[PDB]
Structures are given as C-alpha cells and as structure tokens.
C-alpha cells in the first residue's frame, strides 16, 4: 500500500509500516500563499521533531521510554490495543490525557539524562 | 518557573530548567511575518546541525571528549556551578567559544573514524 | 555539627528481612551522596552500597548485588536501607556515610567526611 | 582488600610512616587514597583525602604520600591521642567501587 494505506488496519500492521507516513509528511500572492503554508508545513514537522527529541526519541520512529503507565488512562489490555482497535480510536480515547503523557516523558527523559550524565563522571 | 525562569539564578538551578527554553525557540505585513519565521527556523536548524556534528543530537545535555584548557578559564567547579549566572559565564568565554567549537568538531570527527574502525573488525 | 542519627537494630532470623534508617542534620542533606559501610566485630571495614544525591542512582557489592535496596527521601532529609533474605556474615555495625560520590556539577570526592553511630546488626 | 602491615609501632616524639599496598588498577590506576581512623568502640574519622590534600580540622601532623602502586601516611611526634586503628581505602574500578584495607595498630610504646 501507499499513503495511510493501513488507515482503519489493526494497530500492528499500521506500525509496521510508519515510514511512508513519515516520508510524507514533507511534500503573485499565490507566490505568498505557496511560501507561508510551505513555511508552516516545515514548522510543523520541526515541532513534532523537536517534541520527539526532547524525550531523546529523535533519530527513531519506535522509541521506548520508562514512563509507568498508569491505568486511569486506560486499562484496555494489550490485546485490543494491538489486536482489535484502529488509531483514529486509539486517539480519540487518550485525547483527554495526551497532554499529562507528554508532562511524564519530559520529567523521565530529564532525570534519565542527569543520570546518564552522573554515571559518566565516575572515573 | 517559566521562559528564563531562572537566568539570572545560579548555575545548577538553570541546568535542569533548559527544557522550556528549548522549546520556546518555535504585504506590508505578510512578508515580514515571513521574513521573521523563517530566520527563526534557520536559526533552529543551524543551532541543531552545530549540535549534530557533535555527536550531541537529540540531546540538551551532552558530553565530550576535548581536555579543558585552562587558558579558557581556571575557576574551579564549586566557584562557577555555584556562584554565577549564565550570563556572567557566556561573558567570560566569549572569545574561546570558536576555538572550542572547533576542538569539539575535530574531536567527534576522531572519535568517529575510531567507532568506525571498531566495527569494521570482524 | 553535623550529626547523623541511626535507629536501626539488630534482630532477625537469618532468613528474615531487616530496616534501617538514618536521619542526618546539621548540612544540606540534599547536596551530599551517602553510603552505607560495614565493619564486622573484629575485622577490617568495608563498604556496602552507595547512593548519589538525588536517589535516583544506585550502587551495591559484589557480595549482595542482588538483595540490598538502599533509598533516600530529600524533603524528610532520611536514608533508608532494606535488607533482604541476609546472610549470617551479615552480622556487623553498619555505619552511614556522607560522600563517595558527587555529581559532575560539584567535585570529585571520592571519600567519606561524617560517620554516624551505626548500629549493630544480629542474625537469630 | 589491601595489603598493609597488620600492626606497627613507636614511641612520643618520633615521626612513624605506615604503607599500603596494592595492584596496579588498584592505587596506580586512580590517585583517590583516603586514610580513616577509628579509636577502639567508636565511629570512624576521616584523616586523609586524596593522596595529599587534607581535610579541614585535621592536624598539621598527619600527611600522606603515594608512590608506584603503594601510598603511605605519615604522622610526626606522637601524642597520646593518637592511638587509633587506621584503614586503607581507594577508588579502584567502576563495577568494584570500593576495596579497603584490613587493621593497622599503631601500638604507641
């Protein structure tokens, strides 16, 4: 398939294939129409970036973190999550936590960092 | 506390507040809203690069592999990570930045030939 | 001056579990790394586990990698130690210790300044 | 642990050195060697940090030296305090942090 070709697919067979979506996601006052929506196109991705490697999962699409995952979120097991549910679900589920996710992932990166820099200081 | 929440608290307090700086770094009218943005995200991109060619990618904090001449600065860790801000620091090297940046690369430029020779051996 | 209470105690079987704590005053609990640091009834000292100064690092022996759980709590300013399965060995005046270990920020130590009082461990 | 004398003596007045010994990533490796004495019952004291410096409130007498992969702690004229059991210690590899010494008793005579 292409472009969001596992769109409605379970959540494994759309991971496996993340690459084309990210591929993707980069392509006279039409001359400043082309240049500010291309402009907040690149924003956009930068953000996302930077939001990714603040957590020190840049230079990676499958980052693993160290975050407990609490259950008031969700207490679906595992094999709905990734047997029998879709994205758009998914998302629409954690809408209302995304935010404290994300809280979470700056707090652990920040202290797994500190310790990463402490163990380099031993001789 | 917030955008230069703590710049002029002393060292170790801003060491760990550096992500919402980070973060904080994203016609008459139309072009030069433009103009603005996009020297914005050169800036971004250049600053990501310099960090890039260090091996520090992805990273706020980092670590290398270049000794500390002391002619850049001899006061002693107690001294700056206790009693200065980061101002008075910037200050204080401004003229050695270059060379440092310039050791820094030549050093990961090392390290990385090193690594490479490492995994060429079977 | 810095004084570094210990409550600890010694009474277990030797397959049991003990707690130990330690409440120190007198400086910055928080700026110092502690340790934990055995001396047996005759014999020379040594060292027991390690832990940096925001807890969220930790260090042990060879001899109980896998058993000892030393952790801290900043705000209550208390070292804490739990024992786990033990070994007749064991038995020794355990003593707290600031330094060890620092973080990059401040200096190398690579010592140990205050020693409290202890106490003595006893295996059933 | 650290090969050291088991025990030594001497007498008031004379200065008395006591050495330590040890393998090469032992001492030779890292020039972290501390000295701590504990009188007999009592909780241990640190004399000295690093191979030279010393600590804040610690005599003028008491002095350390390292040599090879051996250091050495130096005291001068004995007073009658100064009777205590002194332990070796060292920063000796980053999985094995720490490796001591066994007893020195400085039997003052």
């Known amino acids: 398939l292409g472009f969001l070709g596992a769109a409605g697919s379970t959540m494994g067979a759309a991971s496996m294939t993340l690459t084309v979506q990210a591929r993707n996601l980069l392509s006279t006052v039409w001359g400043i129409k082309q240049l500010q929506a291309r402009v907040l196109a690149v924003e956009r991705y930068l953000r996302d970036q930077q939001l990714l490697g603040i957590w020190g999962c840049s230079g990676k699409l499958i980052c693993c973190t160290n975050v407990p995952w609490n259950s008031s979120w969700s207490n679906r097991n595992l094999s709905e999550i990734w047997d029998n549910m879709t994205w758009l679900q998914w998302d629409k589920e954690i809408s209302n936590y995304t935010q404290i996710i994300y809280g979470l992932l700056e707090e652990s990166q920040n202290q797994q960092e500190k310790n990463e820099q402490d163990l380099l200081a031993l001789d | 506390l917030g955008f230069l929440g703590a710049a002029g608290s002393t060292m170790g307090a801003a060491s760990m507040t550096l992500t919402v700086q980070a973060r904080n770094l994203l016609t008459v009218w139309g072009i030069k809203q433009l103009q603005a943005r996009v020297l914005a995200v050169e800036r971004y991109l250049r600053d990501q690069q310099l960090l890039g060619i260090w091996g520090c990618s992805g990273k706020l904090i980092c670590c290398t592999n270049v000794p500390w001449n002391s002619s850049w600065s001899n006061r002693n860790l107690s001294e700056i990570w206790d009693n200065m801000t980061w101002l008075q620091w910037d200050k204080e090297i401004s003229n050695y930045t270059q060379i440092i940046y310039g050791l820094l690369e030549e050093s990961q430029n090392q390290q990385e030939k090193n690594e490479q020779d490492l995994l060429a051996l079977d | 001056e810095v004084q570094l209470v210990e409550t600890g105690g010694g009474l277990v079987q030797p397959g049991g579990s003990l707690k130990l704590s330690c409440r120190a005053s007198?400086?910055?609990?928080?700026?110092?790394?502690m340790s934990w640091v055995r001396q047996a009834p005759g014999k020379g000292l040594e060292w027991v586990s390690l832990?940096?100064?925001?807890?969220?690092?930790?260090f042990y022996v060879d001899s109980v990698k896998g058993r000892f759980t030393i952790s801290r709590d900043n705000s209550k300013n208390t070292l804490s130690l739990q024992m786990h399965s033990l070994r007749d060995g064991d038995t020794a005046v355990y003593y707290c210790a600031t330094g060890g270990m620092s973080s990059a920020l401040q200096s190398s130590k690579y010592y140990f300044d205050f020693w409290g009082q202890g106490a003595l461990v006893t295996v059933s | 642990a650290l090969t050291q004398p088991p025990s030594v003596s001497g007498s008031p007045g004379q200065s008395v050195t006591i050495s330590c010994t040890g393998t090469?990533?032992?001492?030779?490796?890292?020039?972290?060697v501390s000295w701590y004495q504990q009188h007999p019952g009592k909780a241990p004291k640190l004399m000295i940090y690093?191979?030279?410096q010393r600590p804040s409130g610690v005599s003028d007498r008491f002095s350390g030296s390292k040599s090879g992969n051996t250091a050495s702690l130096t005291i001068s004229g004995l007073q009658a305090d100064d009777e205590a059991d002194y332990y070796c210690?060292?920063?000796?590899?980053?999985?094995?942090?720490?490796?001591f010494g066994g007893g020195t008793r400085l039997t003052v005579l």
């Open positions: 007198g400086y910055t609990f928080s700026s110092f790394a």
């Open positions: 690093d191979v030279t």
């Open positions: 210690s060292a920063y000796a590899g980053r999985q094995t942090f720490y490796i």
């Open positions: 090469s990533s032992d001492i030779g490796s890292y020039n972290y």
């Open positions: 832990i940096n100064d925001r807890g969220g690092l930790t």
